[PDB]
């Protein structure tokens, strides 16, 4: 599924992301945009045998098991296929665990590069939340 900007913002709000570990909702929307262009089917290989899955490009080395990544730690306790669903619940619950790491949202390089430090409130402007 390819989400609309405000459709995604609303779904994320209902799942508890606004102000999670000090990050306002627009951070998460902006991250999703630059990670996947809002496409739940997005995948990208990593040069290490792991793969990034879904709207938030969550990797199979640490976070989910895809059955083809040697030594996956599967910290989110989920098959990576669950991150490709039209329902973003699994992706959001996993994303909260990633953002609980020392470096927070810096785990997403696209967020660091394109979102961090900007007025991310813009990403939820015009949405009825």
Curated annotation (Swiss-Prot):
Q: List the disulfide bonds.
A: 6-127, 30-115, 64-80, 76-94
Tell me which domain of life the UniProt entry assigns to the organism this sequence originates from: Eukaryota
Q: Which UniProt keywords apply?
A: Antimicrobial, Bacteriolytic enzyme, Disulfide bond, Glycosidase, Hydrolase, Secreted, Signal
First-tier enzyme category under EC: hydrolase
Q: Which GO terms describe its molecular function?
A: glycosaminoglycan binding; identical protein binding; lysozyme activity
CDD domains from the xrefs? LYZ_C
Gene3D superfamilies (UniProt xref): 1.10.530.10
Q: May I have one GO cellular component term? A: extracellular space
Q: Does the keyword Disulfide bond apply?
A: yes
Q: Where in the cell is it found?
A: Secreted
C-type lysozyme domain: residues covered: 1-129
InterPro entries the record matches = Glyco_hydro_22 (IPR001916), Glyco_hydro_22_CS (IPR019799), Glyco_hydro_22_lys (IPR000974), Lysozyme-like_dom_sf (IPR023346)
Function, as annotated, reads:
Lysozymes have primarily a bacteriolytic function; those in tissues and body fluids are associated with the monocyte-macrophage system and enhance the activity of immunoagents.
Any miscellaneous information on file? Answer: Lysozyme C is capable of both hydrolysis and transglycosylation; it also shows a slight esterase activity. It acts rapidly on both peptide-substituted and unsubstituted peptidoglycan, and slowly on chitin oligosaccharides.
Tell me its family.
Belongs to the glycosyl hydrolase 22 family.
* UniProt name for this protein: Lysozyme C
* Phylogenetic lineage: Eukaryota, Metazoa, Chordata, Craniata, Vertebrata
